[PDB]
Amino acid sequence: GRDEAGITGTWYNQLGSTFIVTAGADGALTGTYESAVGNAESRYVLTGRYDSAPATDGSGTALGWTVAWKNNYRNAHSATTWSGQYVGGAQARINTQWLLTYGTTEANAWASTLVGHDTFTKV
Amino acid sequence: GRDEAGITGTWYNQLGSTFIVTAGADGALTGTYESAVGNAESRYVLTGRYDSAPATDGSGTALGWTVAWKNNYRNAHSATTWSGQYVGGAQARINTQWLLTYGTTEANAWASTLVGHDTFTKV
Amino acid sequence: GRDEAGITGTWYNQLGSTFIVTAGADGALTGTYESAVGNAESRYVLTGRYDSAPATDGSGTALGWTVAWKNNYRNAHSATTWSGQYVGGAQARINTQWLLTYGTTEANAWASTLVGHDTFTKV
Amino acid sequence: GRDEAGITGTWYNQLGSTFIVTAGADGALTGTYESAVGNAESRYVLTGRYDSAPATDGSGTALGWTVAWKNNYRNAHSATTWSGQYVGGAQARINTQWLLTYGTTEANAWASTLVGHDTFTKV
Ligand SMILES: O=C(O)CCCC[C@@H]1SC[C@@H]2NC(=O)N[C@@H]21
Ligand SMILES: O=C(O)CCCC[C@@H]1SC[C@@H]2NC(=O)N[C@@H]21
Ligand SMILES: O=C(O)CCCC[C@@H]1SC[C@@H]2NC(=O)N[C@@H]21
Ligand SMILES: O=C(O)CCCC[C@@H]1SC[C@@H]2NC(=O)N[C@@H]21
């Protein structure tokens, strides 16, 4: 993929969380996520996808991934999805918006979903 | 997983799109998506995660998945993430909210991301 | 406004909440909201804006409004914004997506904002 | 209102847009918005609401507002809502997430709504 090398590695967001990803040639993303906040401890599995043949006109590279917040330590009964774009160069970034959905009863489902935004850097 | 059997299979949303997923015991989701709308044709790879040990108190099952909108036919230079919950029973549903991010230039990045909501049924 | 008459009146969403609005010629929206759910009781002030000269090509009419969830009875320390479009005709609707922000400490601000979607009808 | 004085005035976001607001004692927000981006020129009317009696525990102040993107110069057939919180102190900020809805045909309504985030400062 054009940015396979650029995306693969360890990223950090403004909260202090750590995103560890491998980009495959075909568009896969696999890795681990460790949140600095919330009902979370240690690493969680992630998977996702990215555009392995982006535009050559200076546009970013679209991608996304999911974490279900269950591991051997905790289960928050929740999942987050991040949707965003990789922007390459000396100050590389992944700019995302995310959706965190809790399992709820039907009566509470109106209040099931948090929205926010994370920016990941290599430093 | 508690809902491995409930989630695995073919789902359809209010647009007429078709979501084909396999749920693994461990929390994986793998499959294909075919959109009835947008800059899309035929099937695209998806991956995601779900809570394989949900609450037993009538709450839904949190899950999410991604599609990068590249296949052998088209490349929209975009990715969607769906975040939601599976609700089991005679009228099973997956209720989601989604985020569709386009690769953009930095000048247009304010306008990179669409938000919406899809409800999937087995019929 | 083109839809001043169509928008003005009493609307109900899928939760059972009641939206009472007056549309002004100039684009204003003023009224009251009464939620069927959440940390809310009785009516709350709303204000917002709508496109008073929409496209004539069958497109909906863009609009939005806010409620801060303080009245004489309760204060949730929160505000919701609905962003959407009015679609006229025998089955008129307002289709919206909303953002509910809580006041939080800086440590909890990542979790400050809920997202959802409401559809309002005249019946 | 507790933050009537703190909110009232001229704010600027990371795009260079200019938000000019007056906060009323009762919870009103009135003013003008001028966007540095998009299908916009000059000032547009805004209205909204804020929590005029916030928590005293260091939490921010919830608020929101709307702009319909029609004025004497242009009509984008769209509306944005910002939902967020005011945080007072030497570095005051308004942190928001927003929803920009376009009027669309029913066939294109899935793609009607952009989501993003703006941070406003006094400098
Ligand atoms: O509390 C939970 O339900 C599980 C932890 C969620 C942490 C969220 S995911 C979005 C944001 N970005 C992070 O790095 N952490 C929070
Ligand atoms: O146009 C694109 O960029 C690729 C197709 C996007 C189709 C979207 S994904 C969200 C919504 N749900 C669907 O089933 N289709 C649309
Ligand atoms: O709980 C709160 O903070 C105040 C009540 C919020 C009720 C929300 S606003 C979005 C959704 N639509 C409704 O009609 N009610 C809920
Ligand atoms: O293009 C349009 O439909 C009207 C202009 C929209 C400008 C948006 S509103 C959200 C973001 N914040 C800004 O200051 N400008 C853009």
XYZ file of C-alpha atoms and ligand atoms in Angstrom:
556
model
C 0.000 0.000 0.000
C 1.209 3.604 -0.647
C 1.239 4.409 3.066
C 1.746 0.951 4.441
C 5.134 2.024 5.788
C 3.867 5.451 7.009
C 0.952 3.982 9.002
C 2.593 0.940 10.509
C 3.970 1.575 14.023
C 3.143 3.213 17.355
C 0.951 6.305 17.624
C -0.087 8.442 20.540
C -3.146 10.689 20.995
C -3.777 13.923 22.965
C -5.101 11.827 25.909
C -1.909 9.790 26.165
C -3.408 6.651 24.677
C -1.230 4.315 22.618
C -2.265 2.880 19.215
C -0.025 0.106 17.841
C -0.900 -0.886 14.250
C 0.305 -2.907 11.346
C -0.901 -1.930 7.873
C -1.120 -4.789 5.337
C -0.554 -4.397 1.581
C -4.221 -5.218 0.850
C -5.754 -2.550 3.167
C -5.853 -4.383 6.530
C -5.150 -2.798 9.877
C -4.381 -4.946 12.900
C -3.002 -4.106 16.282
C -3.631 -3.078 19.833
C -4.992 -0.062 21.664
C -4.353 1.029 25.204
C -6.557 3.877 26.490
C -5.254 6.462 29.026
C -8.934 7.111 30.080
C -12.193 5.401 30.761
C -13.213 1.867 31.801
C -10.074 0.308 30.338
C -6.861 -1.283 31.345
C -3.934 -2.722 29.385
C -4.175 -3.540 25.662
C -7.208 -4.383 23.512
C -7.391 -5.911 20.075
C -8.145 -3.648 17.152
C -8.872 -4.224 13.497
C -9.671 -1.932 10.653
C -9.086 -0.913 7.031
C -7.300 1.801 5.097
C -7.164 3.012 1.483
C -4.055 1.272 0.110
C -4.113 3.308 -3.153
C -4.806 6.948 -2.110
C -5.061 9.962 -4.381
C -1.713 11.492 -5.431
C -2.942 15.089 -5.245
C -1.877 15.776 -1.630
C -5.095 14.316 -0.077
C -4.872 12.284 3.083
C -5.424 8.516 3.289
C -8.813 7.392 4.595
C -8.885 4.720 7.306
C -10.758 3.377 10.283
C -10.646 0.925 13.047
C -12.567 -0.643 15.924
C -11.909 -1.665 19.515
C -14.386 -3.680 21.526
C -13.544 -2.919 25.155
C -13.215 -6.484 26.380
C -9.905 -8.114 27.278
C -8.693 -10.451 30.043
C -8.876 -7.715 32.609
C -12.083 -5.783 32.033
C -15.240 -5.643 29.966
C -16.852 -2.221 29.515
C -19.580 -3.599 27.305
C -18.738 -0.963 24.695
C -16.993 -0.443 21.375
C -15.299 2.532 19.771
C -14.808 3.201 16.088
C -12.346 5.764 14.790
C -12.847 7.187 11.279
C -10.212 9.491 9.858
C -7.329 10.225 7.581
C -3.547 9.725 7.682
C -1.537 12.730 6.632
C 2.137 11.876 5.902
C 5.281 14.184 6.184
C 7.611 15.335 8.982
C 4.832 16.020 11.333
C 2.726 12.847 10.358
C -0.730 12.622 11.890
C -3.845 10.508 11.998
C -6.876 12.857 12.431
C -9.962 11.066 13.579
C -13.493 11.371 14.820
C -14.879 8.461 16.914
C -18.084 6.912 18.026
C -18.237 4.991 21.392
C -21.362 2.857 21.713
C -22.360 1.190 25.000
C -24.661 -1.842 25.130
C -27.869 -0.541 26.689
C -31.463 -1.480 27.318
C -33.918 -0.302 24.661
C -35.261 2.385 27.141
C -31.692 3.867 27.457
C -30.578 3.401 23.796
C -31.091 7.118 23.037
C -28.108 7.736 25.320
C -25.915 4.880 24.078
C -23.368 6.713 21.942
C -20.529 9.209 22.707
C -18.808 11.205 19.979
C -15.393 12.767 20.025
C -12.181 13.426 18.126
C -8.581 12.157 18.576
C -5.393 13.298 16.847
C -2.515 10.766 16.783
C 1.163 11.614 16.367
C 4.320 9.568 16.199
C 5.798 11.423 19.260
C -19.315 -15.609 22.045
C -22.845 -15.158 23.529
C -24.174 -13.696 20.283
C -21.786 -15.294 17.865
C -24.681 -17.226 16.340
C -27.095 -14.226 16.446
C -24.691 -11.865 14.637
C -23.264 -14.180 12.025
C -25.119 -13.980 8.683
C -26.631 -11.535 6.193
C -28.119 -8.201 7.250
C -29.865 -5.474 5.338
C -30.227 -1.748 6.115
C -32.940 0.857 5.350
C -31.006 1.888 2.185
C -31.013 -1.638 0.782
C -27.351 -2.276 1.491
C -26.180 -5.789 2.343
C -23.853 -6.608 5.281
C -22.466 -10.167 5.348
C -20.562 -10.973 8.568
C -19.001 -13.782 10.476
C -18.590 -13.372 14.235
C -15.649 -15.266 15.791
C -15.625 -16.689 19.334
C -12.900 -14.223 20.405
C -14.730 -11.018 19.298
C -13.726 -10.765 15.610
C -15.994 -9.616 12.827
C -15.122 -10.336 9.212
C -17.125 -10.084 6.055
C -18.269 -8.016 3.143
C -20.396 -4.943 2.568
C -22.251 -3.910 -0.533
C -23.703 -0.372 -0.502
C -26.979 0.490 -2.327
C -25.785 4.180 -2.485
C -22.773 6.323 -3.077
C -19.468 5.866 -4.940
C -19.550 2.085 -4.579
C -20.070 -1.027 -6.557
C -20.055 -4.724 -5.656
C -18.604 -6.019 -2.369
C -15.947 -4.519 -0.084
C -13.983 -6.103 2.711
C -14.977 -5.313 6.265
C -13.486 -6.072 9.644
C -14.494 -5.207 13.139
C -15.026 -6.318 16.742
C -17.893 -7.147 19.066
C -18.352 -7.792 22.796
C -18.282 -11.603 23.024
C -19.391 -11.602 26.707
C -22.251 -9.036 26.944
C -24.246 -8.123 30.025
C -27.089 -10.534 30.894
C -29.486 -7.799 32.015
C -31.239 -7.285 28.647
C -28.608 -4.798 27.306
C -27.571 -4.967 23.691
C -24.170 -6.174 22.459
C -21.689 -3.465 21.481
C -19.886 -3.816 18.146
C -18.300 -1.972 15.272
C -16.786 -2.359 11.922
C -14.971 -0.608 9.083
C -15.078 -0.546 5.294
C -12.450 1.204 3.228
C -14.150 1.942 -0.091
C -11.554 0.398 -2.370
C -12.072 -2.845 -4.274
C -11.228 -4.099 -7.780
C -13.861 -1.917 -9.331
C -13.705 1.477 -7.656
C -11.818 3.557 -5.131
C -13.761 6.340 -3.400
C -10.805 7.321 -1.272
C -12.997 7.043 1.825
C -13.769 4.824 4.794
C -16.862 4.292 6.902
C -17.042 3.081 10.473
C -20.244 1.809 12.037
C -20.566 1.825 15.846
C -23.621 0.253 17.417
C -25.345 -2.505 19.277
C -26.917 -5.864 18.380
C -30.295 -6.480 19.922
C -31.371 -10.162 19.716
C -34.988 -11.644 19.605
C -37.647 -12.220 16.926
C -37.176 -8.876 15.406
C -33.259 -8.867 15.729
C -31.532 -5.620 14.820
C -28.160 -3.956 14.619
C -28.617 -0.214 15.443
C -25.709 1.888 14.359
C -24.336 5.352 13.896
C -21.543 5.805 11.294
C -18.769 8.106 10.338
C -17.665 8.365 6.628
C -14.307 10.093 6.224
C -12.960 11.151 2.811
C -9.249 11.720 2.173
C -8.932 15.468 1.656
C -6.382 18.229 1.403
C -5.628 20.022 4.673
C -7.600 23.126 3.387
C -10.755 20.919 2.922
C -10.314 18.671 6.023
C -13.023 20.579 7.943
C -15.488 19.057 5.473
C -14.030 15.539 5.400
C -16.522 13.610 7.516
C -20.221 12.614 7.061
C -22.315 11.271 9.924
C -25.410 9.148 9.762
C -27.308 6.195 11.187
C -28.203 2.739 9.762
C -30.520 0.079 11.178
C -29.894 -3.508 9.979
C -32.449 -6.318 9.991
C -32.356 -9.947 8.988
C -35.205 -9.408 6.420
C -40.331 32.070 4.561
C -41.244 29.286 2.054
C -41.884 26.790 4.847
C -42.778 29.173 7.609
C -46.296 27.737 7.658
C -45.108 24.093 7.270
C -42.653 24.284 10.197
C -44.667 26.290 12.674
C -46.604 24.099 15.144
C -46.297 21.021 17.356
C -44.047 18.088 16.474
C -43.437 14.764 18.125
C -40.404 12.440 17.963
C -39.980 8.633 18.201
C -39.285 8.983 21.971
C -42.562 10.785 22.619
C -40.970 14.181 23.118
C -42.860 17.317 22.100
C -41.315 20.169 20.054
C -43.405 23.359 19.825
C -41.964 25.922 17.374
C -42.735 29.146 15.648
C -40.902 29.914 12.406
C -40.374 33.630 11.648
C -40.260 35.126 8.137
C -36.563 36.032 8.544
C -35.337 32.510 9.511
C -35.908 32.485 13.299
C -37.109 29.513 15.284
C -38.489 29.966 18.782
C -40.396 27.661 21.039
C -40.348 25.018 23.699
C -39.191 21.435 24.051
C -40.386 18.800 26.450
C -38.313 15.589 26.562
C -39.919 12.163 27.263
C -36.453 10.920 28.494
C -33.442 11.939 30.471
C -32.780 14.481 33.248
C -35.684 16.693 32.199
C -39.092 17.743 33.274
C -41.695 20.080 31.777
C -40.848 22.582 29.019
C -37.528 24.221 28.109
C -36.820 27.209 25.929
C -35.467 26.608 22.458
C -34.142 28.845 19.726
C -32.757 28.178 16.318
C -32.657 29.062 12.616
C -33.955 27.703 9.334
C -33.405 28.396 5.624
C -36.303 30.722 4.746
C -35.587 30.515 0.972
C -34.922 26.797 0.230
C -34.140 25.246 -3.130
C -37.182 24.566 -5.353
C -35.842 21.276 -6.717
C -37.488 18.977 -4.131
C -34.658 19.359 -1.533
C -35.519 19.619 2.121
C -35.183 22.790 4.213
C -32.127 22.988 6.466
C -32.648 24.013 10.096
C -31.384 23.665 13.625
C -32.086 24.478 17.162
C -30.768 24.373 20.722
C -32.086 23.563 24.184
C -30.090 24.241 27.314
C -31.515 21.861 29.914
C -32.213 24.402 32.629
C -35.699 25.543 33.612
C -37.477 26.306 36.903
C -37.620 22.666 37.815
C -34.278 21.109 36.945
C -30.806 21.843 35.653
C -28.988 18.995 33.893
C -25.982 21.145 33.137
C -26.237 20.138 29.477
C -27.353 21.366 26.073
C -28.606 19.615 22.966
C -28.417 20.831 19.396
C -30.498 19.328 16.617
C -29.330 19.757 13.003
C -31.570 18.548 10.213
C -33.978 19.136 7.403
C -37.738 19.695 7.073
C -39.397 17.666 4.371
C -42.923 18.931 3.518
C -45.960 16.919 2.099
C -48.687 14.666 3.538
C -46.331 12.806 5.708
C -44.233 15.956 6.770
C -41.110 15.257 8.795
C -38.160 16.913 10.451
C -35.147 14.512 10.214
C -32.393 15.384 12.602
C -29.121 14.359 14.133
C -28.253 15.829 17.577
C -25.365 16.502 19.837
C -25.886 16.549 23.681
C -22.965 18.119 25.530
C -22.630 17.944 29.330
C -20.526 20.429 31.306
C -17.583 18.393 32.573
C -14.199 18.748 34.191
C -11.268 18.890 31.769
C -10.257 15.282 32.834
C -13.755 13.994 31.768
C -14.236 16.221 28.658
C -13.432 13.314 26.300
C -16.735 11.806 27.443
C -18.805 15.003 27.374
C -20.856 14.546 24.213
C -23.669 12.122 23.170
C -24.797 11.773 19.566
C -28.095 10.539 18.257
C -30.894 11.025 15.750
C -34.572 12.079 16.123
C -37.355 12.061 13.534
C -40.289 14.436 14.201
C -43.797 14.062 12.794
C -46.965 16.075 13.090
C -48.868 13.041 14.564
C -25.871 34.199 34.377
C -22.635 32.929 36.047
C -20.697 33.158 32.787
C -22.699 35.831 31.068
C -19.673 38.126 31.196
C -17.181 35.342 30.258
C -19.124 34.260 27.147
C -20.178 37.610 25.775
C -17.763 38.966 23.133
C -15.732 37.962 20.078
C -14.302 34.469 19.634
C -12.128 32.929 16.980
C -11.739 29.279 15.910
C -8.819 27.247 14.467
C -10.125 27.962 10.917
C -10.033 31.723 11.417
C -13.788 32.104 11.696
C -15.247 34.817 13.921
C -18.083 34.219 16.433
C -19.620 37.362 17.968
C -22.090 36.598 20.790
C -24.084 38.203 23.512
C -25.124 36.048 26.468
C -28.374 37.086 28.207
C -29.078 36.620 31.931
C -31.833 34.069 31.184
C -29.696 31.718 29.005
C -30.030 33.324 25.544
C -27.263 33.561 22.995
C -27.525 35.975 20.088
C -24.994 37.190 17.606
C -23.269 36.736 14.307
C -20.938 34.230 12.699
C -18.527 34.741 9.861
C -16.943 31.567 8.432
C -13.364 31.546 7.020
C -14.345 28.450 4.894
C -17.107 26.997 2.827
C -20.055 28.447 0.874
C -20.209 31.574 3.024
C -19.494 35.227 2.920
C -19.832 38.026 5.476
C -21.889 37.637 8.670
C -24.833 35.341 9.445
C -27.323 35.465 12.267
C -26.928 33.014 15.108
C -29.017 32.112 18.115
C -28.594 29.622 20.872
C -28.747 28.830 24.593
C -26.369 28.302 27.486
C -26.595 27.044 31.079
C -26.876 30.270 33.103
C -26.426 28.440 36.456
C -23.537 25.952 35.918
C -22.070 23.576 38.468
C -19.533 25.136 40.873
C -17.246 22.094 40.930
C -14.913 23.192 38.097
C -17.155 21.785 35.287
C -17.554 23.724 32.087
C -20.740 25.529 31.021
C -22.888 23.745 28.441
C -24.098 25.744 25.435
C -25.075 25.591 21.802
C -25.999 27.616 18.851
C -27.211 27.538 15.253
C -26.444 29.309 11.990
C -28.591 28.896 8.915
C -26.308 29.776 6.005
C -28.535 32.344 4.344
C -27.840 36.077 4.366
C -28.118 38.905 1.817
C -25.159 37.627 -0.110
C -25.451 33.856 -0.339
C -27.652 30.903 0.494
C -25.916 27.546 0.974
C -29.150 25.794 1.813
C -27.545 24.442 4.985
C -27.402 24.914 8.740
C -24.750 24.221 11.344
C -25.249 23.547 15.025
C -22.429 23.759 17.538
C -22.773 21.891 20.855
C -20.113 22.369 23.494
C -18.865 23.805 26.722
C -17.314 27.104 27.848
C -14.288 26.745 30.057
C -13.360 30.016 31.845
C -9.849 31.202 33.095
C -6.793 32.880 31.536
C -6.841 30.710 28.535
C -10.751 30.724 28.126
C -12.144 28.402 25.478
C -15.351 27.196 23.915
C -14.876 23.505 22.894
C -17.452 22.322 20.443
C -18.566 19.578 18.134
C -20.841 20.565 15.197
C -23.299 19.141 12.782
C -23.729 20.755 9.281
C -26.883 19.592 7.515
C -27.567 20.376 3.841
C -31.081 20.353 2.374
C -31.133 17.341 0.065
C -33.473 15.163 -1.930
C -34.702 12.050 -0.120
C -32.398 9.868 -2.380
C -29.314 11.879 -1.165
C -30.388 12.367 2.505
C -27.971 9.650 3.703
C -25.185 12.062 2.747
C -26.766 15.240 4.130
C -24.770 15.792 7.312
C -21.097 16.715 8.045
C -19.596 16.412 11.515
C -16.619 18.207 12.939
C -15.133 20.015 15.919
C -14.161 23.685 16.521
C -12.248 25.223 19.424
C -12.818 28.967 20.019
C -10.433 31.303 21.830
C -10.515 34.964 22.706
C -7.241 35.605 20.738
O -14.877 3.579 28.951
C -15.053 2.744 28.042
O -16.229 2.392 27.655
C -13.867 2.008 27.366
C -12.722 3.065 27.174
C -13.065 4.150 26.104
C -11.936 5.066 25.961
C -12.200 6.119 24.807
S -12.242 5.529 23.120
C -12.366 7.221 22.553
C -11.300 8.051 23.363
N -9.962 7.921 22.859
C -9.202 7.282 23.745
O -7.962 7.086 23.539
N -9.822 6.899 24.859
C -11.232 7.324 24.800
O -19.540 7.185 -1.465
C -18.594 6.674 -0.834
O -17.619 7.379 -0.374
C -18.480 5.141 -0.626
C -19.927 4.612 -0.325
C -20.471 5.076 1.065
C -21.800 4.509 1.280
C -22.344 4.866 2.725
S -21.538 4.122 4.136
C -22.789 4.832 5.199
C -24.179 4.567 4.505
N -24.681 3.237 4.708
C -24.696 2.575 3.553
O -25.144 1.387 3.474
N -24.245 3.253 2.501
C -23.854 4.608 2.927
O -30.570 14.285 30.264
C -30.277 15.446 29.918
O -29.068 15.888 29.962
C -31.359 16.470 29.488
C -32.404 15.690 28.613
C -31.831 15.243 27.230
C -32.876 14.562 26.469
C -32.368 14.187 25.016
S -32.060 15.515 23.861
C -31.763 14.304 22.578
C -32.915 13.235 22.687
N -34.149 13.653 22.085
C -35.080 13.818 23.022
O -36.273 14.145 22.724
N -34.681 13.586 24.270
C -33.265 13.180 24.260
O -20.530 25.612 3.232
C -21.593 25.796 3.856
O -22.600 25.002 3.740
C -21.810 27.041 4.755
C -20.463 27.293 5.520
C -20.149 26.192 6.584
C -18.905 26.523 7.273
C -18.605 25.489 8.435
S -19.677 25.494 9.865
C -18.599 24.303 10.652
C -17.123 24.808 10.427
N -16.725 25.850 11.330
C -16.539 26.986 10.662
O -16.138 28.042 11.246
N -16.769 26.921 9.353
C -17.166 25.548 8.996
